[PDB]
Amino acid sequence: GTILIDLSPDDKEFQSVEEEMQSTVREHRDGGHAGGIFNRYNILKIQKVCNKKLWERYTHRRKEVSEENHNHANERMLFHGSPFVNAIIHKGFDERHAYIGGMFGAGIYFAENSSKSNQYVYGIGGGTGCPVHKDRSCYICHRQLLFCRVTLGKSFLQFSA
Amino acid sequence: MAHSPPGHHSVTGRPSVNGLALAEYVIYRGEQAYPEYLITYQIMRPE
Ligand SMILES: Nc1ccccc1-c1nc2ccccc2c(=O)[nH]1
Ligand SMILES: [Zn+2]
Numbered sequence: 001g002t003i004l005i006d007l008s009p010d011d012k013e014f015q016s017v018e019e020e021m022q023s024t025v026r027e028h029r030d031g032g033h034a035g036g037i038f039n040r041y042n043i044l045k046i047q048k049v050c051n052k053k054l055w056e057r058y059t060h061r062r063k064e065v066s067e068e069n070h071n072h073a074n075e076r077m078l079f080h081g082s083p084f085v086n087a088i089i090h091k092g093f094d095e096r097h098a099y100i101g102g103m104f105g106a107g108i109y110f111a112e113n114s115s116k117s118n119q120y121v122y123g124i125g126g127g128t129g130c131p132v133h134k135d136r137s138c139y140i141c142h143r144q145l146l147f148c149r150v151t152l153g154k155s156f157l158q159f160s161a
Numbered sequence: 162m163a164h165s166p167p168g169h170h171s172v173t174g175r176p177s178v179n180g181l182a183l184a185e186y187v188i189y190r191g192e193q194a195y196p197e198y199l200i201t202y203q204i205m206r207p208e
Contacts, residue, residue, distance in 0.1 A: 004199060017198050026181050038204035045201040054195060061192035065170050074170075077197070078186060089199060093191035098162045104172040104187045105163035108194065112183035118204070139206045147198040152186060153170025161178040 002054070002090045004047040014046050017147055020077070025115045034126035035119035036137030044142060054092045058149070065153040074152040078110035081117035083127070085144050099124070104158060110150055117145050165189045 007014040022040055032038075066073040082088065084097050093108055100106045101124070111117045121143045122129055122136065129136035165171060170193070176182035188194060 017200065021200060021202070024183065026183070029179065036204045037207065039207055040205050041202040042205050043200065043202050045199075047199045047201075049196050049199055057192050058195040061190060065193070069170070076186070080194070080196070085199070089196050093194050093196070095162045095191070097191065102187065104174055105189075107162050107165075107172070107187040107189040108191065110186045110188070110194070112185070116183075116185065137204070139204060142201055142203060145200045145202070146196045147200060149195045149197050150186065150188060151170070151193040152173070152188070153193075154168065155171045155173040155186070156166040156169040157173050157175055159175050159177045161176075 002049060002051040004049060004089070007046045007048060013048075017046050018043050020147065021079075021114045021145070024079070024113045026113050028115065028119065030119075032137060034136060035115060035121075036126075036139075038115075038137075041114075049089050049146075051089075051092075057092060058151075062151045065151050069153045072153075074155065076110075076150050076152060078112060078148055078150045079114045079117035080108075080110050080146040080148050081120035082146070083121070083123050085146060088146065103160065110148060114145060118143070121145065162189050 126136035
């Protein structure tokens with residue numbers, strides 16, 4: 001039951017999402033190995049993902065968390081890069097979309113830096129890069145990221161390198 | 162998936178070395194995220 005609605009580049013919603021994407025690019029300690037060498041993106045399309053069942057699943061859990069945390073969901077907008085983007089938008093996030101070897105355990109990982117999530121579009125550490133050219137720094141192939149509404153609730157703070 | 166730490170709903174990975182890095186976050190329940198926007202893009206080659 002997912003439909004995708006194209007946003008016009010003239011829409012303030014398009015513009016605020018593009019600004020979050022562009023403004024959260026940083027340099028990475030791998031010199032671009034995983035995600036490629038770049039300072040900015042060419043945004044080709046921004047689509048709103050509409051699925052009533054998945055939205056209600058989200059808001060149900062959000063209420064549960066809020067009620068466990070003095071009526072505070074601690075909701076953020078965060079990036080997610082994944083080879084399973086098509087499955088996620090149609091069926092929702094689940095255990096198949098987790099990072100099993102992640103430094104904070106097997107869970108679903110999100111980033112404030114869009115460029116961090118860009119490192120995972122083609123798999124962990126960029127995998128073998130784009131399907132067509134096998135290039136983690138491909139400037140031709142179209143990539144996709146999700147910009148996601150995430151309920152953090154009470155979050156365990158891990159200081160880490 | 163693993164469980165959240167007892168009494169918590171997520172983990173925040175705070176950067177402690179790279180001064181320019183922003184936080185990363187982990188959830189342990191798929192129902193705690195909704196994929197709002199799908200962004201299609203290319204990375205641009207620096208000039
Ligand atoms: N590591 C992953 C494995 C499968 C699907 C997605 C990811 C992934 N991991 C991340 C780790 C840290 C910060 C962001 C991400 C992310 O966007 N995707
Ligand atoms: Zn390519």
